[PDB]
């Protein structure tokens, strides 16, 4: 059982990278992949870079080059659900592009031709993630996570996302790309991110101040999820 | 005689003419993409049908580079013309590609730029020069310049206006180019976009696209055919 883990920023993968034993590093297509075991479990950790294309490139290499069984996307996110606070966890049951638009031809907003309107996360990955959340007494929300190539900082950007996806519990920039690639390779995935800001007018400041806290919380959650998938 | 030219088209209509001309053709179905290998007028090529959008294009370009390792990449297909002297059917050649929908300005990056990437991705000077040479020999009307990509089909209104304001110099807009340039950049692979105009991204761009997708395909395909030959034998 090999578990793939994808993080966008170094800060989001560094703590996990530090724990990987029998660690080997591969530099490819401008990305870095770290293989080895995390607390006894075989993993493949990828630092992709920010945005949809970087994450897609990275996920593609990870899949074709290491062949993981499942993909877990870790990292930070802007919280949209009213119950969310910095440090809290968001688990995807689904991912959709909030910035894709081909409605001129009758596709659903957010949907790209040749893809389903939304990519569903894997049920077992979701259940495991949630049992970890319960065992660690974490505050979390499960639901629609939307991705785009823009940092949401209130104003018009936030308004468009609320209009098109009022039920989105969070927004970020790599999730759906990873889901899309996993979809094309028939690989199950799940997003498990921690909130660094609430995508409003002060989100840049909040991101500066809470990225580290978000990276650590999601990172700990990924660690527990790996262990739970590996030994029930 | 030992060069392998990678060619990427998003839709089936856009790759079908080139595909039919491939000698000793074979097909590879992988990651939801299709790759056709063989030769084009004797030159070894690898033609990928990527699907629409930045992620589809990135996934395909990554598979193409990693799997077939072509020496250069040519992105063919249709596009919305933005430069004034462009008419449906005319050719657009990129000298650069930028995302018109990437925005991390809140952190000081340039509009269109993603962290870790240059603000724009430069196309290859030789591929560009060869393309202009083909344009001259075929006596076609064409424009060289910045091409911008996003995950939205530009249909006039604010979508179009924001693009003209943020990129006054952009000559065309489509949905895969920059994603392909981005992937080629990370692998350090020369690329060039050579597309043909199917609409002018205004209120009627969907209707125009319906009616002229075919001609855009024909014209970009003819150019691709001529460029492959040119790159192989001058
Ligand atoms: C430095 S760009 C923000 C990064 N962190 C995630 C993120 C956190 N908070 C937000 C993100 N992305 C967009 N809008 C937000 N409010 C995204 O996926 C990028 O990798
Ligand atoms: C069916 S979406 C349009 C496709 N054709 C290209 C295109 C032509 N004209 C336009 C395109 N894309 C966006 N806006 C336009 N006005 C894009 O790269 C997609 O692959």
CB B94 within 8 A of CB B223: no
Residue A56 sits at the chain B interface (C-beta within 8 Å): yes
B103 tagged catalytic: no
With vertex at residue B211, the alpha carbon angle to CA B61 and CA B173, rounded to the nearest 5 degrees, is 40
Distance B133 CA to ligand 1 centre (A): 44
Indicate if A12 belongs to the active site: yes
Question: Does B156 lie at the interface with A, CB-CB under 8 angstroms?
Answer: no
B124, B174, B199, B225: which is the annotated catalytic residue? Answer: B199
Atom of ligand 1 nearest to the CA of A153: 16
B20 touches chain A (CB under 8 A): no
A152 lines ligand 1 (CB under 6 A): yes
Buried b or exposed e, range A141-156, using 16+ CB within 10 angstroms: bbebbbbbbbbbbbee
Q: How many CB atoms lie within 10 A of CB B43?
A: 18
Contact call for B106 and A204, based on CB within 8 A? yes
Strands (E), B50-199: 72-81, 91-99, 121-122, 142-149, 172-174, 191-199
Query: Strands (DSSP E) along B153-234, which ranges?
Result: 172-174, 191-199
Q: Residue A169 phi/psi, 5° resolution?
A: -90, -10
CB burial string A52-86: b at 16+ within 10 A, e below: bbbbbbbbbbbbebbebebbbbbbbbbbbbeebeb
Distance from CA of B12 to the nearest CA of A (A): 12
Residue carrying the six token digits 């005689």: B1
Test A29 with B103 for CB contact under 8 angstroms: no
Token output for A72: 């877990």
Instruction: Evaluate whether B179 touches B100 at the Cβ level (below 8 Å).
Output: no
Cβ–Cβ contacts within 10 Å for residue A227, how many? 16
Q: What is the DSSP letter of A107?
A: P
Q: Is the dihedral of CA B191, B132, B80, A162 positive or negative?
A: positive
Q: What is the resolution of this structure in A?
A: 2.2
Alpha carbon dihedral A202, A208, A211, A213, in 10-degree steps, equals: -90
**Residue appearing with tokens 């262990």:** A227
With CA atoms as reference, report the closest residue to B198 among B63, B52, B106, B86: B86
The domain tally of chain A equals: 1
Q: Does A153 touch chain B (CB under 8 A)?
A: yes
Helix (H) or strand (E) holding A210: helix A203-230
Tell me the C-alpha distance between A171 and B164, whole Å. Answer: 27
* CA distance linking residue B108 with residue A150, whole number of Å: 13
CA distance A231 to B171: 56
Nearest atom of ligand 1 to the alpha carbon of A9: 20
State yes or no: A40 annotated in a binding site.
no
Please indicate whether residue B68, judged by its CB atom, sits closer than 6 Å to ligand 2: no
**Contact at CB, B206 and A54, closer than 8 angstroms:** no
**β-bridge partners, A161:** none
Q: Do A54 and B101 touch (CB under 8 A)?
A: no
**Residue B31 Cα distances to B4, B5, B182, B185, angstroms:** 21, 21, 19, 21
Residues in contact with B58: Cβ distance below 8 Å, sequence separation at least 6, in sequence order: A52, A53, A56, A57, A60, A177, B179, B180, B182, B183
Q: Is the dihedral of CA A152, A158, A160, A161 positive or negative?
A: positive
* Residue A29 at interface with chain B, using a CB cutoff of 8 Å: yes
What residue has token string 């959008």?
B53
- B175 annotated among ligand-binding-site residues: yes
Calculate the dihedral angle through the C-alpha atoms of A111, A112, A113, A118, rounding to the nearest 10 degrees: -40
Q: Which atom of ligand 2 is nearest to the CA of B150?
A: 13
E-strand ranges in A1-139 read 3-7, 21-28, 31-38, 41-47, 70-79, 89-97, 119-120
Among B17, B15, B229, residue whose Cα is nearest residue B133? B229
Q: Of the ligands numbered here, which is closest to the C-alpha atom of B105?
A: 1
**Pairwise CA distance, residues A138 & A44, whole Å:** 26
- Three-state secondary-structure class, residue B46: strand
Q: In angstroms, rounded to a whole number, what is the distance separating the alpha carbons of residues A109 and A112?
A: 8
Residue A200: CA count within 13 A, CB half-sphere: 9
Helices (H), A30-174: 52-66, 123-135, 155-164
CB contact under 8 A, A102 and B66: no
Residues in chain B: 234
Residues recorded for chain A: 232
Domain range holding A4? Answer: 1-232
- Determination approach: X-ray
Question: Domain containing A153 — which CATH number?
Answer: 3.40.50.1580
Among the options A42, A122, A197, A223, which is catalytic?
Answer: A197
Residue A105 token pair:
């031809």
């Amino acid at each position: 059982m090999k578990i793939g883990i994808i993080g966008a920023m170094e800060e989001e993968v560094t703590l996990l990278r530090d724990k990987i034993e029998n660690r080997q590093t591969i530099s490819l297509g401008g990305c870095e992949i770290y293989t080895g075991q995390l607390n006894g479990t075989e993993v493949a950790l990828l630092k992709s870079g920010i945005g949809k294309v970087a994450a897609a490139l990275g996920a593609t290499l990870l899949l074709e080059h290491c062949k993981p069984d499942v993909i877990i996307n870790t990292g930070s996110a802007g919280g949209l659900a009213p119950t969310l606070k910095v440090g809290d966890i968001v688990v995807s049951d689904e991912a959709r592009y909030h910035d894709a638009d081909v409605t001129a031809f009758g596709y659903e907003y957010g949907q790209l031709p040749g893809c389903p309107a939304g990519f569903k996360a894997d049920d077992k990955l979701i259940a495991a993630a949630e049992a970890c959340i319960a065992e660690l007494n974490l505050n979390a929300v499960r639901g629609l996570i939307v991705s785009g190539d823009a940092f949401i900082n209130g104003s018009v950007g936030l308004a468009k996302i609320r209009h098109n996806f009022p039920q989105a519990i969070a927004v970020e920039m790599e999730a759906t790309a990873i889901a899309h690639v996993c979809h094309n390779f028939n690989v199950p995935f799940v997003v498990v991110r921690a909130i660094s800001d609430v995508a409003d007018q002060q989100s840049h400041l909040s991101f500066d101040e809470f990225l580290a806290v978000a990276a650590k919380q999601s990172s700990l959650m990924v660690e527990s999820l790996v262990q739970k998938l590996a030994h029930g």
